[PDB]
Curated annotation (Swiss-Prot), chain B:
The record marks Y150 as: Histone H3K9me binding. Heterodimer; heterodimerizes with EHMT2. Interacts with WIZ and EHMT2. Part of the E2F6.com-1 complex in G0 phase composed of E2F6, MGA, MAX, TFDP1, CBX3, BAT8, EHMT1, RING1, RNF2, MBLR, L3MBTL2 and YAF2. Interacts (via ANK repeats) with RELA (when monomethylated at 'Lys-310'). Interacts with MPHOSPH8. Interacts with CDYL. Interacts with REST only in the presence of CDYL. Part of a complex containing at least CDYL, REST, WIZ, SETB1, EHMT1 and EHMT2. Interacts with BAZ2B. This is Histone-lysine N-methyltransferase EHMT1. Zn(2+) 1 binds at C57, C59, C63, C68. One of its GO terms (cellular component) is nucleoplasm. Keywords: Acetylation, ANK repeat, Chromatin regulator, Chromosome, Disease variant, Intellectual disability, Isopeptide bond, Metal-binding, Methyltransferase, Nucleus, Phosphoprotein, Repeat, S-adenosyl-L-methionine, Transferase, Ubl conjugation, Zinc. It comes from Homo sapiens (Human). One of its GO terms (biological process) is positive regulation of cold-induced thermogenesis.
Length: 260, 261
């Protein structure tokens, strides 16, 4: 019903992300800053030395098995349309290394999906029972990149002293150091995606312009055909529900719900 | 005959292809460097990227009014509706330009965003007769248009002072504090091929977009007049270059007002 914003991203995405409310009188969310890429407040010494990148020397479109970046990904998982292959392990996704600016290939090679940004037509909307949510305005085939989980990159020490923990995405411990993305104060459309026990999205760790393994980027891919109008959802995991289960129960409505 | 030796030296990284041609000799497309479309580093530079340190505007319009904070930092917004520098822009002593950024309240299509939109002109790398490779425009370029950025490897002054090849350095001079340099010898974009001209049709301008760390301005070339289709691009290398290289060769820009021949 009520169109309360024509584009919450104010033109920073390749297509607008409108916001509508047909439930109550809440206006468009405004208690955060929309950013389309990750940001920092305190410094994160991400390794950006260009000579530290692994890269490929392909002269084709990076469809051969000799592509170093495909080999780092165990294989290039992207088909001719940029969708994950049917055999992609959705239960335990691998890391994806996309091609980068040190590679000899062209900017339009096969192994570049997440770095081309959001393409699906999404919409922020007011749900009946769990606040704001995100839905697709179009059919999304299986294995399509939907959106990235974008926010403020913070250390574990910083996360342990933040009053609000509902917008944290853990980049769990590759070593002693561990970091997370906090979308509470800075974030993109993904900060409004609700939990579902049978999720139509799965997060995948991706490396594009750097390969600092402490700082993967979080890309959501569809696990099935998402029909037009369907709400997006992913599995928040057990750390969330072991903390928030004390306060409320899951309202995903799935007959296979595990937290209600 | 004009040999096409590359369809795009940028391999698709620019909005427009930049082909390379050679009607002079049998030299192939230059390949002794790595093309990058934006600045890179090898040793860390600790650029201040704290989002709360950005100055930003709160404009409710397209940032075309007098109240835009980012225009005020630039002493005024110098861009017209087409993204070109106003005729009042001081080409002889350009001010610092602060474009709008992701902390501003405005939209991504506001007026104060030109260099962050990337290269737009149709350019061409080509073999000259007595200057090696050069860059020309394939189209008319109106005055005050953003043409290309000087892109390369960001290095410190002490690193530059131990590099054997100095012909691709762009100085980021600092009146106070540490001084840095862009070296396009090993990593660079199309701008590393632009030759010196004593009456140049390009002027470099220091611009800030995603960060405002004054140690690291980005270098944007704007046209100083109409550049016609076919014309070679050129800017003034300055005195530090010619005080060093003038001992080896004379300027061949061919201008009637050449100052280094
Ligand atoms: C509530 O759900 C989480 C809560 C916490 C999480 C992650 C959580 O959900 C992750 C998935 C759900 N997301 C929702 C949107 C996107 C995915 N992560 C951290 C990190 C764990 C490992 C890496 C370093 C810190 C621990 N702290 C947590 N809450 C504490 C914070 C500090 N105190 C008080 C001082 C307020 C209370 C408890
Ligand atoms: C030859 O032209 C330059 C030469 C030098 C420059 C700048 C120059 O031209 C700038 C304009 C021309 N460009 C051409 C393309 C784009 C603009 N910069 C400096 C400093 C760098 C950072 C601190 C302030 C200035 C260093 N010295 C330089 N050559 C020395 C380097 C070390 N070797 C040996 C010790 C190995 C001795 C010569
Ligand atoms: N499946 C679910 N059941 C109940 N509440 C949920 C839920 N999924 C998400 N939420 C709510 O949404 C928060 C995650 S942030 C997701 C956006 C949120 N709906 C908003 O309006 O800002 C959780 O803290 C929880 O309060
Ligand atoms: N006006 C000029 N007169 C003589 N040589 C010039 C010149 N402008 C540029 N050059 C040459 O080009 C170098 C700058 S790098 C510019 C690209 C270069 N022509 C190339 O083929 O790689 C200078 O060191 C000088 O060798
Ligand atoms: Zn490859
Ligand atoms: Zn590659
Ligand atoms: Zn590739
Ligand atoms: Zn559930
Ligand atoms: Zn403004
Ligand atoms: Zn602004
Ligand atoms: Zn603006
Ligand atoms: Zn001259």
């Amino acid at each position: 019903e009520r169109i309360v914003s024509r584009d919450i991203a104010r033109g920073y995405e390749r297509i607008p992300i409108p916001c509508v409310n047909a439930v109550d009188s809440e206006p468009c969310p405004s208690n955060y800053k929309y950013v389309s890429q990750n940001c920092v407040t305190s410094p994160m010494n991400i390794d950006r030395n260009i000579t530290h990148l692994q890269y490929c020397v392909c002269i084709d479109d990076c469809s051969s098995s000799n592509c170093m970046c495909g080999q780092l990904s165990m294989r290039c998982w992207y088909d001719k349309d940029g969708r994950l292959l049917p055999e992609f392990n959705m239960a335990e996704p691998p890391l994806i290394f996309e091609c980068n600016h040190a590679c000899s290939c062209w900017r339009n090679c096969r192994n570049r999906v997440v770095q081309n940004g959001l393409r699906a037509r999404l919409q922020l909307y007011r749900t009946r029972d769990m606040g704001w949510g995100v839905r697709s305005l179009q059919d999304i085939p299986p294995g399509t990149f939907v959106c990235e989980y974008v926010g403020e990159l913070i250390s574990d020490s910083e996360a342990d002293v933040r009053e609000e923990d509902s917008y944290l995405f853990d980049l769990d411990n590759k070593d002693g150091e561990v970091y997370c993305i906090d979308a509470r104060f800075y974030g993109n459309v993904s900060r409004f995606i609700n939990h579902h026990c049978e999720p139509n999205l799965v997060p995948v760790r991706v490396f594009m312009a750097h390969q600092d393994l402490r700082f993967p980027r979080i890309a959501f891919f569809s696990t099935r055909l998402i029909e037009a109008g369907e709400q997006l959802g992913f599995d928040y995991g057990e750390r969330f529900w072991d903390i928030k289960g004390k306060l409320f129960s899951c309202r995903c409505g799935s007959p296979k719900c595990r937290h209600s």
